[PDB]
Amino acid sequence: TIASSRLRLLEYSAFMEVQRDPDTYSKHLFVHIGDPPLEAVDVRQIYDKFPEKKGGLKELYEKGPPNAFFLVKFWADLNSTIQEGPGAFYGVSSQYSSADSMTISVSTKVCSFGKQVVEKVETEYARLENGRFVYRIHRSPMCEYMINFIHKLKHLPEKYMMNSVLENFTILQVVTSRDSQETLLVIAFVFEVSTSEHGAQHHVYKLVKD
Ligand SMILES: CCCCCCCCCCCCCC(=O)NO
Numbered sequence: 001t002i003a004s005s006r007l008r009l010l011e012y013s014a015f016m017e018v019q020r021d022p023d024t025y026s027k028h029l030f031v032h033i034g035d036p037p038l039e040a041v042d043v044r045q046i047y048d049k050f051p052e053k054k055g056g057l058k059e060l061y062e063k064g065p066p067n068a069f070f071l072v073k074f075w076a077d078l079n080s081t082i083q084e085g086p087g088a089f090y091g092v093s094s095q096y097s098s099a100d101s102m103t104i105s106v107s108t109k110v111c112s113f114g115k116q117v118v119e120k121v122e123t124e125y126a127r128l129e130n131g132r133f134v135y136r137i138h139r140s141p142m143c144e145y146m147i148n149f150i151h152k153l154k155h156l157p158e159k160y161m162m163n164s165v166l167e168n169f170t171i172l173q174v175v176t177s178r179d180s181q182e183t184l185l186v187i188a189f190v191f192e193v194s195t196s197e198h199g200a201q202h203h204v205y206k207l208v209k210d
């Protein structure tokens with residue numbers, strides 16, 4: 001599980017969905033997240049995979065707190081398991097929870113060669129649920145940048161070529177209290193392609209400075 005002192009990620013899910021007919025929908029998951037301790041990774045080995053001026057990962061980690069910084073490696077499933085109808089939905093669903101009511105800002109920077117090409121910013125409002133606070137982003141539609149990228153990768157003949165492109169592709173998710181701008185949760189994403197028919201896999205690491 002991925003949790004700072006202040007906020008916990010419960011679910012993250014990137015997917016495409018197709019309407020075979022008005023009453024029938026196929027949904028394919030690219031990546032999914034749904035309590036062990038975590039192996040550590042030096043944060044200084046990923047500075048080069050994210051923007052590094054002001055608002056950069058180095059200055060974020062230095063601002064603290066350190067209990068907030070994770071790395072997820074995703075084995076993304078890019079199999080055509082659902083028949084490719086044109087005009088399909090490409091979406092991202094995620095849930096967070098906290099003990100305290102707060103208004104959170106969720107920054108999702110898509111990076112190529114350690115440079116921002118897309119930032120998505122969504123403000124989410126606490127909902128009281130079973131004595132805790134929950135934040136739902138439900139079927140947040142993907143940008144054209146990401147849907148094209150997913151098209152480019154699937155039209156490659158060999159998985160090793162996909163993994164070659166993916167080496168230079170990273171996403172940084174930063175969750176802040178809208179008001180205080182206090183860092184609640186930071187998750188660096190790195191990607192390879194899935195080969196096993198077990199499907200999409202993921203590994204979680206703690207980011208440390210040493
Ligand atoms: C890399 C191929 C598998 C797709 C993984 C995508 C995971 C997260 C979806 C992209 C987040 C950016 C949100 C967006 O599309 N626009 O802001």
Ligand SMILES: [Cl-]
Nearest residue numbers: 092108120140
């Ligand atoms: Cl997102």
Ligand SMILES: [Cl-]
Nearest residue numbers: 128129130131
């Ligand atoms: Cl309730």
